[PDB]
């Protein structure tokens, strides 16, 4: 049902080099604060060999000062908590 050797690709070629237009995001990631993660730490009966010091210099400079206290995307604490799991 095809030559199979059909060497080709999609004629899209749509590069669209748009800059980081970060505005009203909508991906998976709840809004949590400092000790707020302390709750995340508990919600996982896993635990094994994590470093609480790395989360300090990782969540402290990703912090976003707001009147709702400091707020960070669970995508930074999930990548900071999953990159230190040996």
């Amino acid at each position: 049902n095809g030559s199979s050797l059909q060497n080709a690709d999609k004629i899209n070629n749509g590069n669209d080099n748009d800059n980081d237009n970060d505005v009203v995001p909508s991906k998976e990631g709840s809004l949590l604060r400092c000790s707020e993660i302390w709750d995340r730490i508990t919600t996982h009966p896993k635990y094994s060999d994590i470093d609480v010091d790395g989360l300090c210099s990782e969540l402290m400079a990703k912090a976003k000062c707001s009147e709702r206290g400091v707020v960070i995307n669970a995508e930074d604490v999930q990548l900071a908590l999953n990159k230190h799991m040996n």
Binding site: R33, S35, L59, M60, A61, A63, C65, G69, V70
Partner: protein, 35 residues
């Protein structure tokens, strides 16, 4: 009647209260300092 909100209460642990948001959180907001 729950019990949240109220801070912890166990100075017998060592000396200061255990709390749950001090130098850790109190400095995570500090970043709000204008450079």
């Amino acid at each position: 009647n729950l019990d949240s909100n109220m801070f912890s209460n166990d100075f017998n642990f060592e000396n200061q209260f255990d709390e749950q948001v001090s130098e850790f959180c109190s400095k995570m907001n500090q970043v709000c300092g204008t450079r």
